[PDB]
C-alpha cells in the first residue's frame, strides 16, 4: 500500500422517517453501515501519519458545509453586497455519527498507539474500510461530544514554534457542560460545569504543557479578540446558536463555588463558519432549550514570545477543519 487521495463515501444509521436534518442529509448522502466489520492487525508494520496533512479532513469539511447550507436556511443571508431572503423555518437539529469509508482498491489505516501524538511513526497499525462514528459537532473553544483519549491527556500540534498554529487538547476524562434556555428575555441562557472537574482538567492540561515547554510556567487567559463566534464558546443547540462567555473558565485569579455558571446569549445574527457572510435566523423556539454535552477537548493558541519565562495559552477556534481533525488524527487513506 501507499498514501493516496481518492473520493471517500460516508455511511451512517440515519433513519429516513426522522425529520432531524442530519438524518435527512445522510439518508440522501450516505450508505448503510456494515453491522459486523473487521480490522486486520498488521505484523511488524510501521507507517507514518500526519493529522495536519490529511485529505480526509477536507472531504468531511465539505460534507458538513453541504449539510448546514441545506439544513439551516436563514431568513437573510448577506454575502458581499448581495442580500438574499428566503423561508427560514425552524428545524430539528441533533448530530448523528458519520463514518468515512475507503472504496474498492483502497483502505484506511488506523493508528492504535494509545498515546500517538498525531504526527510521526506508528508501530501499531490496523486496516479498516471505514472510520468510527464521528459526530460533526460545530463549536469553538471547547470540543464537545467527541471521543476521549484512552490513556492520559494528549496535546497535539503541528509545530511548537509556530504561534499561528492551533493546539488540539484531547482529554481522557469528560467534563460535562449542561446548557439551558429556561421556559421562563427569550435569548438569555446559561451553562453549568463542575468547578472541580474543570479546575482538575485544566491542571492536567497544564502539566502536559510543561512537558513540551520545559523551563517555563504555564498560564491560561481568555481570548484576546475577534468576532463573538471565537471569543466565546459558540455552538448550535437544537437549531439555536448559543454564545457562552468563558472568561471565568480561563481567568487565573477566578479559577468559592460548586457549579461554575456561564452566561450565554442566543443570537439570530451569526457570522457563518462554513463560508464568507452573515446570516439572520428566526427567534428561538419556546420551551426548555437544553443541551447536556461533554467537553472532550480544547482548542488553544499560544501567545507570541514575550522574556517572562511564562507561556500563555488562550482558547480559540473558528476553522472547523480542526474539529474534524481531532477525530480523524488516527486515520489515513492508502491505495492497495
Amino acid at each position: 500500500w501507499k498514501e493516496a487521495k481518492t473520493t471517500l463515501f460516508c455511511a451512517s444509521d440515519a433513519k429516513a422517517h426522522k425529520e432531524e436534518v442530519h438524518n435527512i442529509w445522510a439518508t440522501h448522502a450516505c450508505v448503510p453501515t456494515d453491522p459486523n466489520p473487521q480490522e486486520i492487525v498488521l505484523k511488524n508494520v510501521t507507517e507514518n501519519f500526519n493529522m495536519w496533512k490529511n485529505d480526509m479532513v477536507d472531504q468531511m469539511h465539505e460534507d458538513i458545509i453541504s449539510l448546514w447550507d441545506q439544513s439551516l436556511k436563514p431568513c437573510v443571508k448577506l454575502t458581499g453586497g448581495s442580500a438574499v431572503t428566503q423561508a427560514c423555518p425552524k428545524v430539528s437539529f441533533d448530530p448523528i455519527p458519520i463514518h468515512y469509508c475507503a472504496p474498492a482498491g483502497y483502505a484506511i489505516l488506523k493508528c492504535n498507539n494509545k498515546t500517538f501524538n498525531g504526527t510521526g511513526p506508528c508501530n501499531n497499525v490496523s486496516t479498516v474500510q471505514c472510520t468510527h462514528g464521528i459526530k460533526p459537532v460545530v463549536s469553538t473553544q471547547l470540543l464537545l461530544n467527541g471521543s476521549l483519549a484512552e490513556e492520559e491527556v494528549v496535546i497535539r500540534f503541528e509545530n511548537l514554534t509556530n504561534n499561528a498554529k492551533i493546539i488540539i487538547v484531547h482529554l481522557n476524562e469528560s467534563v460535562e457542560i449542561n446548557c439551558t434556555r429556561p421556559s421562563n428575555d427569550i435569548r438569555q441562557a446559561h451553562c453549568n460545569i463542575s468547578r472541580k472537574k474543570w479546575n482538575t482538567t485544566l491542571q492536567r492540561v497544564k502539566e502536559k504543557l510543561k512537558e513540551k515547554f520545559p523551563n517555563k510556567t504555564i498560564q491560561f487567559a481568555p481570548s484576546s479578540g475577534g468576532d463573538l463566534e471565537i471569543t466565546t464558546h459558540s455552538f448550535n443547540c437544537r437549531g439555536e446558536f448559543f454564545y457562552c462567555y468563558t472568561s471565568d473558565l480561563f481567568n487565573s485569579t477566578y479559577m468559592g463555588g460548586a457549579n461554575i455558571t456561564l452566561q450565554c446569549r442566543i443570537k439570530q445574527i451569526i457570522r457563518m463558519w462554513q463560508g464568507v457572510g452573515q446570516a439572520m435566523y428566526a427567534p428561538p423556539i419556546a420551551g426548555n432549550i437544553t443541551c447536556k454535552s461533554n467537553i472532550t477537548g480544547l482548542l488553544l493558541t499560544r501567545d507570541g514570545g514575550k522574556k517572562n519565562d511564562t507561556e500563555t495559552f488562550r482558547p480559540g477556534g473558528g476553522d472547523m477543519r480542526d474539529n474534524w481533525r481531532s477525530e480523524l488524527y488516527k486515520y489515513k487513506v492508502v491505495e492497495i
Epitope: 504561534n163 498554529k165 484576546s224 475577534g226 468576532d227 463566534e229 464568507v276 493558541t301
Partner: antibody, heavy 122, light 104 residues
Framework: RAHLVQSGTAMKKPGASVRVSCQTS????????LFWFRQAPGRGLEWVGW????????NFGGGFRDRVTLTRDVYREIAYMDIRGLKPDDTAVYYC???????????????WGQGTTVVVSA | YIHVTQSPSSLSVSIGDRVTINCQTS??????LHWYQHKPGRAPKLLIH???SVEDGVPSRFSGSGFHTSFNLTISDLQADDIATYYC?????FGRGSRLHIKR
C-alpha cells in the same frame, strides 16, 4: 495579483493614538493571514502581530498586545492596526503583508503594502 | 526565540559577478527559511520561500540552498537592479540583512 495599499504618513505626539489601514485586493481576503511588521531607522524588521481575517483571531509579539488592536472589515477587505500610548521609540515604517499560503500559516510574505511612516515626537 | 544572523553584513560586488550570502539560525528550522529583497523607500519583495522555491516572476539568476541552521542565497550574473539589502526570515524572526554595493 494580490495587492495591499496602506494609508499615508502619520505625525503624532507621545501618548496619542494612530490608525493604520491596509486595503487588500486581488485574492480571497479571509483565506490568507495578514501580518504587521515595523522597521525603525537603522534596525531590522520587528514583528507586531497578525490577524486571521476569518473571525479576526489575533496574536502579538513581545509587548504589543498591551497597546495594539488588530481588526478587519470583511466586506471591504481591509485591515486596521490601532496603537495606543504612542512613544518616541514607536517611530518606524509599519508594513502589512499577507501569507502566501491559502488557509494555512507559512510566514512567507508574498504581497506587501508600501509601508506607512509613523513619527512620534513632542 | 530564534536568533537569525546574516553574513557578510556588507559586501562589495561587481556587475556580472556571482554573489552568495549566508544566513544562520540558532536552532534547527528544517527548510522553513525565506529570502527577501529590500531597497530604500520600498516594500520588501519575496524572492525565495522554503529555502529554494523561487517566487513567481523572480529572475532565474536567484537561487537558494541550505538546511537545518545554514542557508545561502546565490545571485548569478549580478545586475544593477540586484544592488539592495537581502533579508532571511523564519517565522516572525527577520535577519538584519546583507547589503550589497558596487566595488570600485
Amino acid at each position: 495579483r494580490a495587492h495591499l495599499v496602506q494609508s499615508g504618513t502619520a505625525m503624532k505626539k507621545p501618548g496619542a493614538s494612530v490608525r493604520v489601514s491596509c486595503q487588500t485586493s486581488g485574492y480571497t481576503f479571509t483565506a490568507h493571514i495578514l501580518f504587521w511588521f515595523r522597521q525603525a531607522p537603522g534596525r531590522g524588521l520587528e514583528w507586531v502581530g497578525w490577524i486571521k481575517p476569518q473571525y479576526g483571531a489575533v496574536n502579538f509579539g513581545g509587548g504589543f498586545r498591551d497597546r495594539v488592536t488588530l481588526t478587519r472589515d470583511v466586506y471591504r477587505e481591509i485591515a486596521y492596526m490601532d496603537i495606543r500610548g504612542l512613544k518616541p521609540d514607536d517611530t518606524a515604517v509599519y508594513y502589512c503583508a499577507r501569507d502566501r499560503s491559502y488557509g494555512d500559516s507559512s510566514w512567507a510574505l508574498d504581497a506587501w503594502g508600501q509601508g506607512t511612516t509613523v513619527v512620534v515626537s513632542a | 526565540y530564534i536568533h537569525v544572523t546574516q553574513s557578510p553584513s556588507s559586501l562589495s560586488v561587481s556587475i556580472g559577478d556571482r554573489v552568495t550570502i549566508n544566513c544562520q539560525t540558532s536552532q534547527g528550522v528544517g527548510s522553513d527559511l525565506h529570502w527577501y529583497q529590500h531597497k530604500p523607500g520600498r516594500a520588501p519583495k519575496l524572492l525565495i520561500h522554503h529555502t529554494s522555491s523561487v517566487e513567481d516572476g523572480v529572475p532565474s539568476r536567484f537561487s537558494g540552498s541550505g538546511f537545518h541552521t545554514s542557508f545561502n542565497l546565490t545571485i548569478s550574473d549580478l545586475q544593477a537592479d540586484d544592488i539592495a539589502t537581502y533579508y532571511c526570515q523564519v517565522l516572525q524572526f527577520f535577519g538584519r540583512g546583507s547589503r550589497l554595493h558596487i566595488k570600485r
